[PDB]
Amino acid sequence: IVVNPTPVIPNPTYTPLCQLDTLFLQANAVGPIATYWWTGPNGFTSHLENPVIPNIYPFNAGSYILTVTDSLGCEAVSTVEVTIYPKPQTPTIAHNAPFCEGTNDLTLTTQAYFGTDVRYIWTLPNGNLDTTFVPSLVLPNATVQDTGAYSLVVWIDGCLSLPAEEIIRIYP
């Protein structure tokens, strides 16, 4: 009686993802695999070695299950946990009415964002790319030398938002 060994249990992989991204799953199966079958979080189903999900939103996140069957008729099952990070949405930048050169402070205010690793990267006319941890840029005793375009991109847990831009005028 010849007894067929089962397939080597696959050890599936994928690359890190953001909210609007492409998920590449890999059926890292070993042996003479004849067919593949995947199931996932929203009814995701596939018969491919390396399924690809374009535009993956943060609800296709979760546990994916791979079943493989070899040509000899034996099965093996393994799973992979897929993590998707949210994309911060574009900030709205509030700013005071232009003030006479040398009064108050150029203050750029945005909505606060939720996450664990949150950074606000601001672009200002001098090119410094000042980075903070709160939704606020402040230049005290601001003057006309500080005018021009300002912008913000928000970094959360590894992903970046589409940037917002505002034009600052002083001494109106």
Next chain:
Amino acid sequence: IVVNPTPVIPNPTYTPLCQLDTLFLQANAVGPIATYWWTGPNGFTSHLENPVIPNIYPFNAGSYILTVTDSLGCEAVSTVEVTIYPKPQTPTIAHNAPFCEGTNDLTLTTQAYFGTDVRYIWTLPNGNLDTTFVPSLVLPNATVQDTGAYSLVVWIDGCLSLPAEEIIRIYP
């Protein structure tokens, strides 16, 4: 007739969690376990001894079930209840327009938070880290000596929010 004892019923564990955290489950199974199978709250499925769920949100909370099968073909089942605490979201700090040194009171107001153990930890220029139980910091008869940056982090049931910061000016 040789009768195989069943596996020793596992007693799974995990560490305490916040809303944005990593869940480490441990299949504390005893005996010659051949295979593991976990199921959970959102279809979570795993074939590992120590499954890890990165970025666990407060919906992966709930009852997890572990089934183990030994090499002799016997099963055992046990469960673990997984608790996840919410992360407070960043506070928005409201403050009065700068007042002439010595009028009214430096008052920092935020939204109230829901929880059982709720603390508002405020950072003020003198470094005291004043702690209260309401979303309010007040310094009566405030003067220019009290100006500078102020911030708040909120503690709820063991977890901390990302902090908010505001700049206080007096005698404008």
